[PDB]
Structure 1
Amino acid sequence: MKESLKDRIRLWKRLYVNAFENALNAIPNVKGVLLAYNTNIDAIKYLDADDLEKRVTEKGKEKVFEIIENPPEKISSIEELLGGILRSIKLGKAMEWFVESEEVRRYLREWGWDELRIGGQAGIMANLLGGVYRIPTIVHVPQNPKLQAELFVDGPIYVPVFEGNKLKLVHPKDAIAEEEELIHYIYEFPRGFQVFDVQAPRENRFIANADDYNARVYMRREFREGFEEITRNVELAIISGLQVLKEYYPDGTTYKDVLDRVESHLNILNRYNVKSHFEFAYTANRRVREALVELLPKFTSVGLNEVELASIMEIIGDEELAKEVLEGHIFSVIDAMNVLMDETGIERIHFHTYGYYLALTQGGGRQLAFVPTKIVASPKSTVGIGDTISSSAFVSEFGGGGGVRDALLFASLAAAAKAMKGNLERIEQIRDALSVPTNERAIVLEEELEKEFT
Structure 2
Amino acid sequence: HMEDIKKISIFLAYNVNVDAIKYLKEEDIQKLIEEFGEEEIIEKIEEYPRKIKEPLDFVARLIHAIKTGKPAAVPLDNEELNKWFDSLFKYDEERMGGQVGIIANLLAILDLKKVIAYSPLLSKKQAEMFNNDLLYPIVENGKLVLKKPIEAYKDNDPIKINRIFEFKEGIKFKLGDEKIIAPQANRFIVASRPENLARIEIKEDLKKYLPEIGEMVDCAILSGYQGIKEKYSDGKTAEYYFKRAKEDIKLLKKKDIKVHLEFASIQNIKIRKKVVDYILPNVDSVGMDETEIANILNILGYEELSEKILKDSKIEDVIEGAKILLDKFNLEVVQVHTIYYILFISKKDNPLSKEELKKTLEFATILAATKAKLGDIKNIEDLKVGLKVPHNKYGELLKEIVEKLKKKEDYKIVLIPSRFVENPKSTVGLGDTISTGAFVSYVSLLKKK
Which of the five TM-score ranges fits, normalised by the shorter chain?
A: 0.7 to 0.9
SS of equivalent residue, structure 2 residue 189? strand
Decide whether the 8 Å contact of 2:194 with 2:227 is kept in 1: no
Shift of 1:38: 0.9
Answer 1 or 2: which has greater helix percent.
1
Partner residue of 2:391? 438
Of residues 344, 365, 372 in structure 2, which corresponds to 1:359? 344
Shift of the 108–360 alpha-carbon distance from structure 1 to 2, 3 Å rule, reads same
Shift of the 363–76 alpha-carbon distance from structure 1 to 2, 3 Å rule, reads farther
Q: Over residues 433-452 of structure 1, what are the superposed CA-to-partner deviations in whole Å (9 max), with x where a residue is unaligned?
A: 22211112111222222222
Distance in 1 between residues matched to 2:284 and 2:243, nearest whole Å: 18
Does 2:52 match 1:75?
Answer: yes
Pairs within 5 Å for 1:76-225 = 76-110=53-87, 111-154=89-132, 156-177=133-154, 178-197=156-175, 198-210=180-192, 212=194, 216-220=199-203, 223-225=206-208
Partner residue of 2:416? none
Distance in 2 between residues matched to 1:257 and 1:441, nearest whole Å: 46
Amino acid at match of 2:18: I
Decide whether the 8 Å contact of 1:131 with 1:157 is kept in 2: no
Distance in 1 between residues matched to 2:111 and 2:150, nearest whole Å: 20
Shift of 1:363: 5.2
Partner residue of 2:249? 266
SS of equivalent residue, structure 1 residue 157? coil
Does 2:287 match 1:309?
Answer: no
Decide whether the 8 Å contact of 1:35 with 1:237 is kept in 2: yes
Decide whether the 8 Å contact of 1:40 with 1:183 is kept in 2: yes
Distance in 1 between residues matched to 2:26 and 2:205, nearest whole Å: 45
Decide whether the 8 Å contact of 2:73 with 2:190 is kept in 1: yes
Partner residue of 1:247? 230
Shift of 1:323: 2.9
Partner residue of 1:234? 217
> Runs of 5+ in structure 2 lacking a partner?
408-449
Decide whether the 8 Å contact of 2:116 with 2:135 is kept in 1: yes
Partner residue of 1:334? 319
RMSD (Å), alpha carbons: 2.5
Distance in 1 between residues matched to 2:92 and 2:56, nearest whole Å: 22
Distance in 1 between residues matched to 2:274 and 2:27, nearest whole Å: 48
Amino acid at match of 1:405: K
Shift of 1:368: 11
SS of equivalent residue, structure 2 residue 74? strand
Partner residue of 1:300? 284
Shift of the 287–209 alpha-carbon distance from structure 1 to 2, 3 Å rule, reads closer
Distance in 1 between residues matched to 2:145 and 2:21, nearest whole Å: 33
Decide whether the 8 Å contact of 2:139 with 2:206 is kept in 1: no
Shift of 1:226: 3.5
- Worse overlay, 182-191 or 316-325: 316-325
Distance in 1 between residues matched to 2:100 and 2:165, nearest whole Å: 22
Q: TM-score, normalised by structure 1?
A: 0.80
Partner residue of 2:273? 290
Distance in 1 between residues matched to 2:297 and 2:160, nearest whole Å: 33
Distance in 2 between residues matched to 1:275 and 1:95, nearest whole Å: 35
SS of equivalent residue, structure 1 residue 247? coil
Shift of the 104–93 alpha-carbon distance from structure 1 to 2, 3 Å rule, reads farther
Amino acid at match of 1:70: E
SS of equivalent residue, structure 2 residue 292? helix
Does 2:323 match 1:323?
Answer: no
Amino acid at match of 1:271: K
- Worse overlay, 191-200 or 336-345: 191-200
- Worse overlay, 185-194 or 50-59: 50-59
Shift of 1:84: 0.8
Of residues 271, 277, 290 in structure 1, which corresponds to 2:260? 277
Decide whether the 8 Å contact of 1:237 with 1:276 is kept in 2: yes
Amino acid at match of 2:181: Q
Shift of the 234–366 alpha-carbon distance from structure 1 to 2, 3 Å rule, reads closer
Percent identity over paired residues? 34
Shift of 1:334: 0.7
- Worse overlay, 69-78 or 201-210: 69-78
Q: TM-score, normalised by structure 2?
A: 0.81
Shift of 1:64: 2.6
Distance in 1 between residues matched to 2:247 and 2:58, nearest whole Å: 39
Shift of 1:294: 2.9
> Runs of 5+ in structure 1 lacking a partner?
1-19, 370-401
SS of equivalent residue, structure 1 residue 75? coil
Shift of the 53–446 alpha-carbon distance from structure 1 to 2, 3 Å rule, reads closer
SS of equivalent residue, structure 2 residue 135? strand
Shift of 1:49: 4.3
SS of equivalent residue, structure 1 residue 142? coil
SS of equivalent residue, structure 1 residue 34? strand
SS of equivalent residue, structure 2 residue 21? strand
Decide whether the 8 Å contact of 1:40 with 1:184 is kept in 2: yes
Pairs within 5 Å for 1:363-378 = 364=349
Pairs within 5 Å for 1:375-386 = none
SS of equivalent residue, structure 2 residue 112? coil
SS of equivalent residue, structure 1 residue 138? strand
Shift of 1:58: 4.1
Shift of 1:366: 12
Partner residue of 2:427? none
Shift of 1:406: 1.1
Q: Over residues 58-95 of structure 1, what are the superposed CA-to-partner deviations in whole Å (9 max), with x where a residue is unaligned?
A: 44543432232332332232211111111122222221
